[PDB]
């Protein structure tokens, strides 16, 4: 059984601000999407130096982008440390985020949509180029949840009985407009990556396929 969960009222007001945009420099999204995931990484790591156990769910550190074209989806996941229910509920929605409103403030005086991450809000960018999003996510303290938005005022929370088994980490499942299915190219990933991440610490595993001839 699904929760439901009202978006707090400037989160909701920045996802609309964010999906109707005609911003011309999305792929910045996943610069966004990288970075959270090396944080993630960064966090189960530092974790680790005083409970080396907490790596024995997943012991390999990675971000792997995985493009399913038949289904107009691109994944992005971690083997970070994850996020409890709790976590979750609130800090992806419920609760004020510090930079949401200065962040469309910004916008509103020519900022650049790339700052975003600057004001801690990057995960947001996602609505770019998704108009809806699974969050999959299994910390070492909780279950697996699902965490669903398609950018309306509110998002669900379930308990995951569907998905692959993410050792421990975080899946983020986007589903692209139809506008913006070159990122589910391998040639176009590459560049994005190349030009905005140039420096992370893990590995970036990108999966591809193809038919065999
Ligand atoms: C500094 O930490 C960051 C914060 C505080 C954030 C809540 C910390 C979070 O608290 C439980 C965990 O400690 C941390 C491990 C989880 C991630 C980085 C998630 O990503 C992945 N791969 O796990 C991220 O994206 C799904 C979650 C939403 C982040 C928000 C709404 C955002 O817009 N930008 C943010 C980017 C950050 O790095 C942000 O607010």
């Known amino acids: 059984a699904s929760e439901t969960f009202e978006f707090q009222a400037e989160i909701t007001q920045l996802m609309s601000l964010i999906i109707n945009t005609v911003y011309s420099n999305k792929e910045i999204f ?11 990484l960064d966090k189960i790591r530092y974790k680790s130096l005083s409970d080396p156990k907490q790596l024995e769910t997943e012991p ?16 992005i996941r971690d083997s970070g440390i994850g996020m409890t229910k709790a976590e979750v509920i609130n800090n992806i929605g419920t609760i004020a985020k510090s930079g ?8 509103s005086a020519g900022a650049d949509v790339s ?5 801690g ?9 998704a ?20 950018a309306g005022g509110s998002f669900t929370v379930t308990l995951d009985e569907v998905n692959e088994r993410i050792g421990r980490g975080t899946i983020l499942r ?40």
């Open 131 to 150: 108009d809806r999003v699974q969050m999959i996510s299994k910390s070492n303290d909780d279950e697996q949840y699902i965490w669903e938005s398609n």
């Open 115 to 119: 700052m975003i991450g600057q004001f």
């Open 174 to 213: 986007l589903f692209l407009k139809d506008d913006q299915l070159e990122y589910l190219e391998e040639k176009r990933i590459k560049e994005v990556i190349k030009r905005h991440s140039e420096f992370v610490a893990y590995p970036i595993q990108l999966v591809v396929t193809k038919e065999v001839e």
């Open 60 to 75: 390999d550190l990675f971000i792997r982008i995985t493009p399913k074209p038949e289904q107009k989806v691109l994944e």
């Open 100 to 107: 949401t409103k200065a962040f469309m403030e910004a916008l």
């Open 30 to 40: 996943l610069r966004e999407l990288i970075s959270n995931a090396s944080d993630a």
């Open 121 to 129: 809000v990057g995960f947001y960018s996602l609505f770019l180029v």
